[PDB]
Amino acid sequence: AEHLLKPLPADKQIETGPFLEAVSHLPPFFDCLGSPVFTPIKAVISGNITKIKAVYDTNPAKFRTLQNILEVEKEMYGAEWPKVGATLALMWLKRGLRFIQVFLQSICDGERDENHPNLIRVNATKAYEMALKKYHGWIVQKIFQAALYAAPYKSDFLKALSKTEEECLEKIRLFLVNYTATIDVIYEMYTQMNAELNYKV
Ligand SMILES: CCCCCC
User: Fold this and answer.
1) Nearest CA to ligand 1 atom 3
2) Which of 159, 163, 172, 183 most suits a substitution to test ligand 1, by most atoms within 8 Å of the C-beta?
3) Atom of ligand 1 nearest to the CA of 161
4) Which helix H or strand E contains 144, and what residues bound it?
5) What top-level class would CATH report for the domain 13-193?
6) What residues contact 2, with CB distance under 8 A and at least 6 apart?
7) Where are the domains of the chain?
8) Alpha-carbon distance 15 to 88, whole Å?
9) Binding positions for beta-D-galactosyl-(1->4)-beta-D-glucosyl-(1<->1)-N-[(9Z)-octadecenoyl]-sphing-4-enine?
10) Contacts for 198 with CB less than 8 Å, ≥ 6 apart
11) 186: how many CB neighbours lie within 10 A of its CB?
12) Backbone breaks in the chain (C–N > 2.5 Å) follow which residues?
């Protein structure tokens, strides 16, 4: 029916396996209505999940938590870390996840352009600016801007998730609870561990 993220534990040590399982339900929503223009945002999530899963699967106990991934790979790659392995993949994945969070939260808070109430371009632009734009050069920005501008009508977007709109929005707010908390904890980990990088693609 739905797929909520696990509750945050008190130690804030998110388990890798259930994390990957949960967020693996997110790329299909880019398909529930999607031309190839939206593939760039989808791929920031999808391609990066695949990279992390690959590392985790080699040794699930060693990479049991996301914190484990960072500390283990810091030991493994030394001074090349954190621009390496699953650490780098998750550094980008958290930004894709953040895009989704801000985009969905914006919609749920009833944020819109009064001139275009059935568009979601202001919501998508807001999310892009606060999640991803900072790490994007001019070339990649155009690629993403093309996707953001091709966004579907709000009514079609909500319809697709619900295959009322107010009841749909209610369910998104519930999903956003543990989803938002989890992402914030991952951002905070990256800062705490000095794993965050600022280079642009
Ligand atoms: C594209 C994000 C949709 C998330 C479904 C709750």
Assistant:
1) 29
2) 172
3) 5
4) helix 138-149
5) mainly alpha
6) 171, 175
7) 13-193
8) 18
9) 44-51, 136, 199
10) 134, 135
11) 22
12) 163
